[PDB]
Amino acid sequence: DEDETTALVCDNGSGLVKAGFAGDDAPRAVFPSIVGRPRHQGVMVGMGQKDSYVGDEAQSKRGILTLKYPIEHGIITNWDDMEKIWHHTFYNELRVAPEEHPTLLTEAPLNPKANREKMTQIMFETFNVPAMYVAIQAVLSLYASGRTTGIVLDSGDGVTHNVPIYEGYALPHAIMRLDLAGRDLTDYLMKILTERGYSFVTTAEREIVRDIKEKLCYVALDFENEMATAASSSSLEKSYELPDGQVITIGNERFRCPETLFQPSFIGMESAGIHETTYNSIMKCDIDIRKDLYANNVMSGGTTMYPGIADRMQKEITALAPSTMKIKIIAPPERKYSVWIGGSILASLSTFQQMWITKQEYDEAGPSIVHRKCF
Amino acid sequence: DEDETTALVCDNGSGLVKAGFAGDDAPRAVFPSIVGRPRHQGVMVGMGQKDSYVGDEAQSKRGILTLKYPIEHGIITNWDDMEKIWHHTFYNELRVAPEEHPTLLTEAPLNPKANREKMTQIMFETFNVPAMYVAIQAVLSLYASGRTTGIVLDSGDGVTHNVPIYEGYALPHAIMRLDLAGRDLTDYLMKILTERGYSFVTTAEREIVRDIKEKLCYVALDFENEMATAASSSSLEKSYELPDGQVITIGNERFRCPETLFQPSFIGMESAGIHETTYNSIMKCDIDIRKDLYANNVMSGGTTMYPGIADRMQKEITALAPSTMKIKIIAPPERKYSVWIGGSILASLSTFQQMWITKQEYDEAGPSIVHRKCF
Amino acid sequence: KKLKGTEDELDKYSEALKDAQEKLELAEKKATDAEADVASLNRRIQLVEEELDRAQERLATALQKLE
Amino acid sequence: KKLKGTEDELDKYSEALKDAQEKLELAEKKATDAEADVASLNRRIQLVEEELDRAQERLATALQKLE
Ligand SMILES: Nc1ncnc2c1ncn2[C@@H]1O[C@H](COP(=O)(O)OP(=O)(O)O)[C@@H](O)[C@H]1O
Ligand SMILES: Nc1ncnc2c1ncn2[C@@H]1O[C@H](COP(=O)(O)OP(=O)(O)O)[C@@H](O)[C@H]1O
Numbered sequence A, B: 001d002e003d004e005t006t007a008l009v010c011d012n013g014s015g016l017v018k019a020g021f022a023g024d025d026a027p028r029a030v031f032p033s034i035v036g037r038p039r040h041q042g043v044m045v046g047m048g049q050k051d052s053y054v055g056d057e058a059q060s061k062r063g064i065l066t067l068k069y070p071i072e073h074g075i076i077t078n079w080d081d082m083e084k085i086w087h088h089t090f091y092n093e094l095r096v097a098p099e100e101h102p103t104l105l106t107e108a109p110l111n112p113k114a115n116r117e118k119m120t121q122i123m124f125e126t127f128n129v130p131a132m133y134v135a136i137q138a139v140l141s142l143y144a145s146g147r148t149t150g151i152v153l154d155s156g157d158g159v160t161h162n163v164p165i166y167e168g169y170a171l172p173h174a175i176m177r178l179d180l181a182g183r184d185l186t187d188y189l190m191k192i193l194t195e196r197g198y199s200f201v202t203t204a205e206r207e208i209v210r211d212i213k214e215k216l217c218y219v220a221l222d223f224e225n226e227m228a229t230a231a232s233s234s235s236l237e238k239s240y241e242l243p244d245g246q247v248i249t250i251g252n253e254r255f256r257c258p259e260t261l262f263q264p265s266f267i268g269m270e271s272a273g274i275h276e277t278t279y280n281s282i283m284k285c286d287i288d289i290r291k292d293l294y295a296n297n298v299m300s301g302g303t304t305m306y307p308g309i310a311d312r313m314q315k316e317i318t319a320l321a322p323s324t325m326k327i328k329i330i331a332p333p334e335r336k337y338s339v340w341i342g343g344s345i346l347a348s349l350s351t352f353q354q355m356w357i358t359k360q361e362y363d364e365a366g367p368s369i370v371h372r373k374c375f
Numbered sequence C, D: 001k002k003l004k005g006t007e008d009e010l011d012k013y014s015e016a017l018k019d020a021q022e023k024l025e026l027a028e029k030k031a032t033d034a035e036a037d038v039a040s041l042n043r044r045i046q047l048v049e050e051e052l053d054r055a056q057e058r059l060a061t062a063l064q065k066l067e
């Protein structure tokens, strides 16, 4: 722990938890949001026999544990799970006590207000954090980009959000949430791999196939033409070496998996591709600034490490929108940490401690005070 | 079909289509303006496999159809959709042939003249109606009220129109259209319910939440005081039984949804509440008759089935306007059919057939004849 | 045995259907009656409201003329 | 096979009974609300009518005094 009473910066992103100290450039403890629990009961002795398993421990013990998600698309299952994982993060991973450091947290866009009131109340009772602040990840990604104008595409693991912000101002009237995310990607890839001869249901293979998505997946420039040329495609077809050692070969599926988000009709969504969701979002607001939105679009999330989103994005928007002004996307490398960086940025300036949510305000007005203290 | 050659009366209201015969008191075939299409392609056989689904058929088949709106705020997407739905209405629902009956139609206020010319031309070519007349729904609601003086607030599902008419004469200089309507209501309620923990995007839940608006919604007498007392409000908070069986509880939202039309700044409109739009409309015209406009205001539309519009209306107008003369609103029960009733009224009198738009006039002067034949 | 339950349920469900359907007929008839009554009452109270309005303007005229 | 046919009829009655109960309940609640509205609207009409009568006596005296 630093000698100074600097604040805690924790991004509880929908899919990854990244925690550390204020003034740091990158979060120190970063782990996926999976939680493992003993698949069977206790009869043995001498070691183990522990209920909750979180972090890399559960990653190593994936096979023996039922792998469960305490949060999915924002919905909260069991607050005890968050209690334990935050205990682990603060003491076993961050080696910090929350008594002496206020916490800045980031929440998924348009999270329930009742969810905020319950989570804040359990937090304040269970923990002894001196002060509090929670913010939407959209403005955090904006801060990471450091440009007040643009539309943020936050692609988490449970929801994809499109949020327009012009000159550092939120536009909730033109903000939308789409239920397509990593979960859907894994599902669709699971069914295609089932049609390829490999049919698995458990979560270990879920992580294997999301790793495959991280490594080999394409974003098709032209879809049906690329499957037409991918009929044989000995060179274009790509293989992976699974940890057991078998060589699993995939061809068109590499660019047929992210295409489900672009073409939702593959597995039955009324909503069109996410580019249509950015398009409608843009026109809902006044006409004039729309061009700037076209030229200032930002994309954020862990998924963004994949190739192909930028070219597809620009080409389709130019197809939909007039091609007079030039559209260009901006995306700094390793932007999944960017939100946490913005949290540090929030703690950088000396005005931030004017609106810390202190203990006594919550003791006076209950959780309801946040309704007036954040917004 | 009646032995007599009486005319067809069809109200294509922005949100509902109500069709029947002249001389009838209520329209026979009434259906919402939603249109369903197959969400996927055809591989099965033995039943179904039909493209267009309209009326109660689509209402029953909402889940497997992409639900699309052939008209939104007056704008026309695809004339083929109107062709099919009119075919369905005339033959499958009204069991009538348009060959032997002239048609009286009602159109949304200030509808495009190009829209009128194209719709009339496709109509005359596709169909074989002997004669035609189309009128604005404002004077139809006036006829339903049967009083030549008043300002009509037409609250459709795409637009809300304020139109003043004094002694049975239209005042286009003081007529305005506001882009707030049922769509906005559903949207705003969708985002609030998202903040309540329930986040849906599809149209089935759109119809569920508009049903909730039909049943439980309030119009707040005082807004912030009613949320202040609605903090707990065990009695004031009201619940609904969704068809799946879950009990969904809503409190202040009941009167925080229609308030948005009155308070557009909630989701960002420069225009103030609709009462301001009626106020400005009134002062635009000569001072003297304004008092009569205050005392003769009429409201029309399906939304009017909700409570609270009358009290709010009068109180705010009295706040804005001097309180010497007494302001009173008039609104007959089941006024969403009233327009169609007025259509029957038009066919009641024997002068109406002096200005039927016959086939030969259109054949001579093309569609352009309507420019001289209606106005 | 499976068949006796089949028939037992058939008989019970049949009698329940008759009772439910007669109840439906009476409920529908009462609904139509009361809806017609509601429409007549709505027309009448509209009449009385406008009449009260008429009384108000004429009262105003009398009080200004007297002044 | 006979049992299949009888079960089909049994099923049809089961669904018809469920639908019948729901529609019966909807009609009954609708028309109970309608009858309550009938009584309430009767009282509203009578009160506005008495107000109107009172206005008529006042207005009669008003016209006399004007003259
Ligand atoms: N190094 C990486 N390369 C590619 N994809 C990644 C990488 N790390 C994480 N992801 C993907 O990002 C997803 C988690 O998204 P996350 O960054 O938590 O969203 P948010 O920005 O809302 O917190 C995971 O499902 C995973 O598939
Ligand atoms: N019985 C009802 N009770 C309450 N609201 C209704 C009812 N029927 C229709 N509506 C509302 O009316 C809207 C349709 O308006 P509509 O009557 O078509 O406008 P217009 O008068 O311009 O035709 C729908 O969005 C629906 O929410």
Ligand SMILES: [Mg+2]
Binding pocket: A013, A154, A155, A156, A157, A300, A301, A302
């Ligand atoms: Mg994200």
Ligand SMILES: [Mg+2]
Binding pocket: B013, B154, B155, B156, B157, B300, B301, B302
């Ligand atoms: Mg209307």
